[PDB]
């Protein structure tokens, strides 16, 4: 029962960004609740929690990259310094939906310099796998024939595609780095 | 709308030219010509809002497109390329719209404030026009949109007030007096 | 073609330096970088009676960047007091500048210049500018930003120094 209820609460709160955009503390509380639900093993809850989060990010993108009252650092930072501890239990597709969600936040930081730093760290995790697979391919190109490494190159790219859909043009700094 | 598009086209053409070859480029036909479309564009925008007589309609239609077109453009410009008249143009609209714009100070001050402040916080000489204007703006906001200074966090507010101290320490009579 | 020593004085931000630059370079300085002490600048105008040279002693207006203040004036042959119509304070101190100057130079053609006429919101109405009258100084309204009455101060001083009321600038090689 609790999961069916929690989902509806999360659906309702997801439909009123106007209210979230006026009440940071609540927004904050909601986002964190979603981050917790992201390790929930009950059926569907993780799909629910991701849908809501991307929804909210899209609609409240600016509040995550600008410092709110009662804080001394933009929420994105906490989120970025923890990506792994949050998404560790998510499935492949859900991880992409998560990356797309943060991508929208990044797209809010119009300030060149800072957006660039945000972007570099945003793509830091996926980049490690990439950089790794790449150096080994520069020793034996038979590796790009390895089932597992090809499965990863797929997922890395898939992640790169979502980030780009949300970040927009500025994402060029990333594309150029691996193009 | 289109006029804003071309304004932004030129504003990005100029900044690049400068970023690629230093201030010097400003001192030649084409650039000075492109500066002119920008400046008259700003004259037109501010020149009308001044003699307008329906604040809300003006704040809900002719103001939001200014954000991405003129403000975030002024933000993304290289220091040498930013148009000082952007600040003074905005100052005039605050004087006119007043309370009807008090809710957009957040969005505006973001783009221009801090980034402009870093151009005028090293000494008391460089970027004269930017000094003068910036404080006509800050004057206006404080004068007709004070509530804004309360909405923002104590950390941001402080940064504002200390900026004022900075004003009245100037040796340029006008800047220090405005402070 | 002999020359002359011209001492330029006034408050800070008055536009003394800016005025001088305009003449030699033709450019207009928008920034305010206060002059420390003095900066001798030779200026040349070509008249119908041979070239003429002014050694502009652009002094400082600020009190802490003063220098050998009254010490610069010695041996002067003409002067220019300048104030800013946007700041009354700089007109109320004019008497102080004329003071120091004549205590060093008893009788030399002087000119009083109200700079910044171009700025629409003028805080020093012409009705108030009367100090030159009883001290028998010449006066002009000027703007280094628009070249308004740009060469009046110098043209007048030339009339006096060369003892010719019909001297005219021409800019002949
Ligand atoms: N609008 C306007 N501004 C002027 C005019 N003349 C000078 N200024 C500005 O006023 C300031 C005056 O600067 P300076 O020429 O260095 O003044 P100053 O008399 O040399 O000051 P000190 O060297 O300290 O004695 C500069 O910022 C100029 O850009 C003018 O005619 N019109
Ligand atoms: Mg000087």
Question: Across the interface, which of A66, A68, A71 has its CB nearest the CB of B110?
Answer: A66
Phi/psi at C80 (5° precision)? -140, 110
Method in brief: X-ray
Three state DSSP letters for chain B? CHHHHHHHHHHHHHHHHHHHHCHHHHCCHHHHHHHHHHHHHHHHHHHHHHCCCCHHHHHHHCCHHHHHHHHHHHHHCCHHHCCCHHHHHHHHHHHHHHHHHCCCHHHHHHHHHHHHHCCCCCCCCCCHHHHHHHHHHHHHHHHHCCCHHHHCCHHHHHHHHHHHHHHCCCCCHHHHHHC
Pairing of strands C110-115, C78-84: parallel
Q: Answer whether A66 touches B (CB < 8 Å).
A: yes
A102 contacts A76 by C-beta, under 8 angstroms? yes
Angle between helices A45-65 and A24-37 (to 10 degrees): 150
**CB–CB contact A71 B72 (8 Å):** no
Contacts of B175 (CB under 8 A, 6+ apart): B131, B132, B135, B167
Residue found under tokens 């996926």: A126
CA dihedral B173, B128, B134, B49 (to 10 degrees): 100
Residue A121 burial class via C-beta count within 10 angstroms: exposed 0-12, middle 13-18, buried 19 and up = middle
3-state secondary structure of A105: helix
Residue C81 burial class via C-beta count within 10 angstroms: exposed 0-12, middle 13-18, buried 19 and up = buried
3-state secondary structure of C73: coil
Q: What Å resolution does this PDB entry report?
A: 2.9
Chain B residues at the C interface, defined by Cβ less than 8 Å, are 124-126, 128-129, 171-174
B135 contacts B113 by C-beta, under 8 angstroms? no
Calpha distance B69→B6 (Å, rounded): 9
CA dihedral B105, B108, B111, B114 (to 10 degrees): -30
Angle between helices B85-97 and B128-144 (to 10 degrees): 10
Phi/psi at C57 (5° precision)? -95, 70
3-state secondary structure of C116: coil
Contacts of C20 (CB under 8 A, 6+ apart): C8, C41, C43, C56, C58
C29: annotated binding-site residue? yes
List beta partners, residue C50. Answer: C47
CA of B163 to the centre of ligand 2 (A): 27
Calpha distance A125→B113 (Å, rounded): 34
Residue A73 burial class via C-beta count within 10 angstroms: exposed 0-12, middle 13-18, buried 19 and up = exposed
User: Which domains occur in chain C, in start order?
Assistant: 1-173 (3.40.50.300)
Phi/psi at C112 (5° precision)? -105, 125
Closest CA to B150 of B108, B92, B105, B110: B105
Q: Report the first-to-last Cα separation within chain B, whole angstroms.
A: 35
Closest CA to C79 of C44, C43, C55, C51: C55
List beta partners, residue C110. Answer: C79
Calpha distance A13→A7 (Å, rounded): 10
* Ligand 2 ion: Cβ-proximal residues, 5 Å cutoff: C 16-17, 35, 58
Pairing of strands C38-47, C50-59: antiparallel
3-state secondary structure of C144: coil
- Give the single-character DSSP code of C35: P
- Give the single-character DSSP code of C81: E
Task: Indicate the helix (H) or strand (E) that contains C46.
Answer: strand C38-47
C90: annotated binding-site residue? no
Task: Indicate the helix (H) or strand (E) that contains C24.
Answer: helix C16-25
- Around ligand 1, the residues with Cβ closer than 6 Å are B 128; C 10, 12-18, 29-32, 34-35, 60-62, 115-116, 118-119, 143-145
3-state secondary structure of C118: coil
Three state DSSP letters for A148-177? HHHHHHHHHHHHHHHHHHHHCHHHHHHHHH
Closest CA to C82 of C28, C25, C154, C33: C154
Pairing of strands C50-59, C110-115: unpaired
Contacts of A175 (CB under 8 A, 6+ apart): A164
Residue C117 burial class via C-beta count within 10 angstroms: exposed 0-12, middle 13-18, buried 19 and up = buried
Residue found under tokens 């089932």: A147
Residue B56 burial class via C-beta count within 10 angstroms: exposed 0-12, middle 13-18, buried 19 and up = exposed
Sheet holding C3-10, edge to edge: C38-47, C50-59, C3-10, C78-84, C110-115, C138-141
Question: Across the interface, which of B75, B152, B156 has its CB nearest the CB of A111?
Answer: B75
Chains in touch with B (≥3 Cβ pairs < 8 A): A, C
Calpha distance B2→A152 (Å, rounded): 45
Task: Indicate the helix (H) or strand (E) that contains C139.
Answer: strand C138-141
Three state DSSP letters for A56-95? HHHHHHHHHHCCCCCCCCCHHHHHHCCHHHHHCCCCHHHH
Calpha distance C74→C67 (Å, rounded): 14
């Amino acid at each position: 029962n609790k999961a069916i209820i929690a989902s509806n609460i999360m659906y309702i709160v997801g439909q009123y960004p106007r209210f979230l955009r006026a009440h940071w503390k609540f927004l904050k509380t909601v986002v964190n609740k979603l981050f917790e639900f992201m390790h929930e093993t009950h059926d569907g809850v993780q799909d629910m929690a991701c849908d809501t989060f991307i929804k909210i990010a899209q609609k409240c993108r600016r509040h995550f990259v600008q410092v709110q009252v009662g804080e001394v650092m933009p929420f994105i930072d906490e989120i970025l310094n923890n990506i792994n501890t949050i998404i560790c239990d998510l499935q492949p597709q859900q991880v992409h939906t998560f990356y797309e969600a943060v991508g929208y936040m990044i797209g809010a930081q119009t300030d060149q310099t800072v957006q660039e730093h945000l972007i570099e760290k945003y793509m830091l995790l996926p980049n490690q796998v990439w950089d790794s697979i790449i150096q080994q391919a520069t020793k034996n190109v038979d590796i790009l024939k390895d089932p597992e490494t090809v499965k990863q190159l797929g997922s890395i790219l898939k992640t790169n595609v979502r980030a780009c859909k949300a970040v927009g043009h500025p994402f060029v700094i990333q594309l150029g780095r691996i193009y | 709308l289109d006029m804003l598009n071309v304004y932004k086209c030129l504003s990005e053409n100029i900044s690049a030219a400068i970023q690629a070859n230093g201030e010097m480029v400003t001192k030649q036909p084409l650039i000075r010509s492109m500066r002119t479309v920008k400046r008259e564009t700003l004259k037109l925008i501010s020149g009308w809002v001044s003699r307008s007589n329906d604040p809300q309609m003006v704040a809900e239609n002719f103001v939001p497109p200014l954000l991405d077109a003129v403000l975030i453009d002024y933000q993304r410009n290289v220091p040498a390329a930013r148009e000082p008249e952007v600040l003074s143009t905005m100052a005039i609209i605050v004087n006119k719209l007043g309370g009807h714009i008090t809710a957009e100070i957040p969005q505006i001050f973001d783009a221009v404030f801090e980034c402009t402040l870093n151009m005028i916080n090293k000494d008391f000489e460089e970027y004269p026009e930017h000094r003068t204007n910036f404080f006509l703006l800050l004057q206006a906001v404080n004068s007709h949109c004070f509530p804004a200074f309360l909405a923002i966090p104590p950390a941001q507010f402080k940064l504002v007030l200390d900026s004022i101290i900075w004003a009245f320490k100037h040796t340029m009579r006008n800047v220090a007096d405005t402070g | 073609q002999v020359q002359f020593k011209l001492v330029l004085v006034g408050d800070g931000g008055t536009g003394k330096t800016t005025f001088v630059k305009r003449h030699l370079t033709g450019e207009f300085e928008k920034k305010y970088v206060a002059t420390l002490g003095v900066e001798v600048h030779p200026l040349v105008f070509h008249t119908n009676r041979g070239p003429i040279k002014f050694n502009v002693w652009d002094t400082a207006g600020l009190e802490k960047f003063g220098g050998l203040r009254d010490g610069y004036y010695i041996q002067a042959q003409c002067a220019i007091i300048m104030f800013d119509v946007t700041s009354r304070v700089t007109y109320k101190n004019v008497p102080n500048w004329h003071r120091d100057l004549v205590r060093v130079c008893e009788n030399i053609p002087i000119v009083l210049c109200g700079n910044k006429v171009d700025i629409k919101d003028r805080k020093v109405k012409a009705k108030s500018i009367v100090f030159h009258r009883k001290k028998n100084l010449q006066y002009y309204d000027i703007s280094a930003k628009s070249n308004y009455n740009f060469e009046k101060p110098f043209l007048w001083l030339a009339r006096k120094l060369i003892g010719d009321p019909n001297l005219e600038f021409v800019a002949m090689p």
